[PDB]
Amino acid sequence: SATIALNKRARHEYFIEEEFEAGLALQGWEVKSLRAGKANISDSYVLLRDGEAFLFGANITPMAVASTHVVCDPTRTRKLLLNQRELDSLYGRVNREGYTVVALSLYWKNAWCKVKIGVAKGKKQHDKRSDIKEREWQVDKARIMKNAHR
Amino acid sequence: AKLHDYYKDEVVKKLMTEFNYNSVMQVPRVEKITLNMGVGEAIADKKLLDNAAADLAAISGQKPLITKARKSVAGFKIRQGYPIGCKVTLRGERMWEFFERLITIAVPRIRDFRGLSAKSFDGRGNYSMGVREQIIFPEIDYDKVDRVRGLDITITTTAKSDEEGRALLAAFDFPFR
Amino acid sequence: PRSLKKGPFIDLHLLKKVEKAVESGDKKPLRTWSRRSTIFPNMIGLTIAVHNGRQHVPVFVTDEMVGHKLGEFAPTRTYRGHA
Amino acid sequence: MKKDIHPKYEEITASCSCGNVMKIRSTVGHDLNLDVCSKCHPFFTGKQRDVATGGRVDRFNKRFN
RNA sequence: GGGGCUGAUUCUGGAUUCGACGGGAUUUGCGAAACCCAAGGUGCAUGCCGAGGGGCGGUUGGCCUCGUAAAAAGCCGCAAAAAAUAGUCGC
RNA sequence: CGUCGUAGUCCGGAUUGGAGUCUGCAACUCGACUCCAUGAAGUCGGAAUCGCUAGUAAUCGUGGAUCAGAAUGCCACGGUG
Ligand SMILES: [Mg+2]
Numbered sequence: 001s002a003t004i005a006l007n008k009r010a011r012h013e014y015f016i017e018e019e020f021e022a023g024l025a026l027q028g029w030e031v032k033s034l035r036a037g038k039a040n041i042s043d044s045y046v047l048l049r050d051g052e053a054f055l056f057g058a059n060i061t062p063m064a065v066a067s068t069h070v071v072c073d074p075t076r077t078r079k080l081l082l083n084q085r086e087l088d089s090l091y092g093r094v095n096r097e098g099y100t101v102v103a104l105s106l107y108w109k110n111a112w113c114k115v116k117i118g119v120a121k122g123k124k125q126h127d128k129r130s131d132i133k134e135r136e137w138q139v140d141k142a143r144i145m146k147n148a149h150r
Numbered sequence: 151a152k153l154h155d156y157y158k159d160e161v162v163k164k165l166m167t168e169f170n171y172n173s174v175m176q177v178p179r180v181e182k183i184t185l186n187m188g189v190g191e192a193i194a195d196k197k198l199l200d201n202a203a204a205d206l207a208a209i210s211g212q213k214p215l216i217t218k219a220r221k222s223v224a225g226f227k228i229r230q231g232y233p234i235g236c237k238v239t240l241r242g243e244r245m246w247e248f249f250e251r252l253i254t255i256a257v258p259r260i261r262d263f264r265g266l267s268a269k270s271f272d273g274r275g276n277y278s279m280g281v282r283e284q285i286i287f288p289e290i291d292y293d294k295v296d297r298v299r300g301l302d303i304t305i306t307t308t309a310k311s312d313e314e315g316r317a318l319l320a321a322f323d324f325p326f327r
Numbered sequence: 328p329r330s331l332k333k334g335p336f337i338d339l340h341l342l343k344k345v346e347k348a349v350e351s352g353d354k355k356p357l358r359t360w361s362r363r364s365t366i367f368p369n370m371i372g373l374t375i376a377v378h379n380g381r382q383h384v385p386v387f388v389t390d391e392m393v394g395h396k397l398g399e400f401a402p403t404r405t406y407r408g409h410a
Numbered sequence: 411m412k413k414d415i416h417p418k419y420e421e422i423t424a425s426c427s428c429g430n431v432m433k434i435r436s437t438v439g440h441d442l443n444l445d446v447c448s449k450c451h452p453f454f455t456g457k458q459r460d461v462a463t464g465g466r467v468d469r470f471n472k473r474f475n
Numbered sequence: 476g477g478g479g480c481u482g483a484u485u486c487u488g489g490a491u492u493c494g495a496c497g498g499g500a501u502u503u504g505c506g507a508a509a510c511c512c513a514a515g516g517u518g519c520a521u522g523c524c525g526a527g528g529g530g531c532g533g534u535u536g537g538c539c540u541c542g543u544a545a546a547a548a549g550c551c552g553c554a555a556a557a558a559a560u561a562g563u564c565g566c
Numbered sequence: 567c568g569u570c571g572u573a574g575u576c577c578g579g580a581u582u583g584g585a586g587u588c589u590g591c592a593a594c595u596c597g598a599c600u601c602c603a604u605g606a607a608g609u610c611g612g613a614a615u616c617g618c619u620a621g622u623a624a625u626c627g628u629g630g631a632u633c634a635g636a637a638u639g640c641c642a643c644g645g646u647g
């Protein structure tokens with residue numbers, strides 16, 4: 001419905017623990033491009049400086065140059081609007097060993113863009129094997145049980 | 151009108167002997183007292199205006215006049231002809247009664263009442279001054295009001311300057327600093 | 328607590344200083360470093376700057392503190408809310 | 411004045427904690443029986459120094475000093 | 476070189492991005508830094524030349540100290556150079 | 567034996583103001599005991615989850631070391647079963 005460019009690869013590439021429905025803060029010519037304008041949310045992650053967890057990786061194509069005064073930067077760091085009450089998770093459980101929180105998807109909420117955030121961590125190519133093995137094994141167990149019980 | 155005549159018999163003499171006047175009609179006289187209560191939040195809730203009017207009637211028995219908007223500023227999102235606030239005016243007997251009641255119980259009140267501001271004259275000396283809430287008056291019940299409705303009360307006088315108004319209020323025993 | 332017959336625990340020096348203050352009639356604060364000392368009725372009417380390591384916090388001792396320790400009026404932690 | 415639209419107007423005694431008796435007429439309804447007033451407020455009726463004090467000796471200097 | 480349609484989540488003239496980030500930094504208690512101005516203490520303090528200053532040098536010359544003039548000591552720079560990056564990813 | 571009768575209960579004993587006591591030069595931070603007084607929560611508790619196969623589960627009390635005192639922690643002991 002109101003869904004926009006989403007990053008479903010990061011869901012398989014990470015272990016999503018908790019999610020944040022926090023909003024995004026962006027300048028002109030970009031929110032219009034969210035409707036149509038080729039926004040891409042690849043390589044998305046938070047870049048906490050002090051309390052400024054900007055989303056760094058996103059390429060939103062500028063569709064016009066009619067205002068040829070401001071310099072266009074598709075790789076701009078977008079600000080994020082999150083409650084200070086729930087921002088404690090981000091200044092907390094991020095820098096342990098490898099914890100990250102990445103942008104899973106971006107959609108519309110009554111003419112305002114909301115980017116879904118999620119706390120996760122890497123898999124080192126050995127957790128992926130275990131996940132695939134378990135996903136296949138549950139299916140195989142169900143199939144063999146059904147075949148045996150006819 | 152007891153305080154009215156009691157203090158009018160002496161302010162005439164004191165001011166006449168102080169300011170070196172030549173007639174009795176040129177002394178600063180209290181024309182009226184004008185008190186309003188801005189309830190501009192009544193845009194969404196009209197019951198606030200009704201409650202403010204009831205509180206004003208309880209403070210001084212009368213019917214508040216609803217002063218509708220005239221310019222309809224967009225900053226506050228108002229439209230002309232809509233109820234925004236309510237005012238009232240007391241003249242003569244009612245003016246003196248309100249003056250007496252207001253000063254007498256408002257002297258012992260909320261926060262460190264070390265007198266009132268001496269620089270609250272509106273250019274000519276009509277002494278507009280504000281009171282924070284309506285629980286000041288024993289007229290208003292303490293634990294029955296929904297909100298607080300203060301009053302920006304102006305003591306509309308005939309004063310030609312600010313020092314004359316100060317002298318008149320001091321004769322009327324005003325809490326000056 | 329202490330035995331009723333043992334007596335209070337005012338300091339050798341603190342007593343000398345308060346006696347000096349009371350017959351000299353000086354309004355300057357008297358700084359004290361003791362923290363487990365009790366209170367005597369003769370200090371009523373004097374300002375005592377008691378030391379807890381951070382600042383010499385002042386106490387304008389009333390006529391309503393004799394039978395306790397003067398240190399109850401000066402905490403040592405710094406906290407008036409998590410946020 | 412208009413008809414019976416304006417509210418109550420009856421004499422009420424403005425008796426405070428101290429010795430003040432008044433014959434105010436207002437709309438509070440019942441008798442005032444109010445509290446500390448301007449005639450007994452520390453603004454000008456004395457008590458310019460008597461606003462706060464260092465306690466008052468009670469049963470503290472008992473059983474040991 | 477010209478016209479015509481879109482630059483409008485309403486094409487519905489009234490959107491608290493719910494949230495962080497500037498605002499009179501409007502508001503209620505309050506610490507001389509959210510400040511602050513003749514009296515109890517009675518000591519050698521105010522303008523006085525000052526004295527060059529914490530490990531080192533300097534501050535609007537009266538921000539430290541005095542009593543017959545000085546060690547300067549309350550702040551900045553030399554200093555505290557470790558600030559330099561989500562995750563997965565050659566040994 | 568009596569007694570209470572299904573109730574925030576004569577259940578439940580915590581927080582509170584004050585009182586002394588043990589104790590160690592000193593219990594405002596920071597002891598424990600006491601008894602008069604307010605008498606909280608809580609009324610078998612989701613998903614989950616742990617321990618036990620016999621004198622053991624489960625209940626009741628006592629004992630021991632640390633240490634001026636400051637055990638629901640620790641280590642032991644038996645009764646019921
Ligand atoms: Mg010991």
Ligand SMILES: [Zn+2]
Binds near residue numbers: 426427428447449
């Ligand atoms: Zn009174």
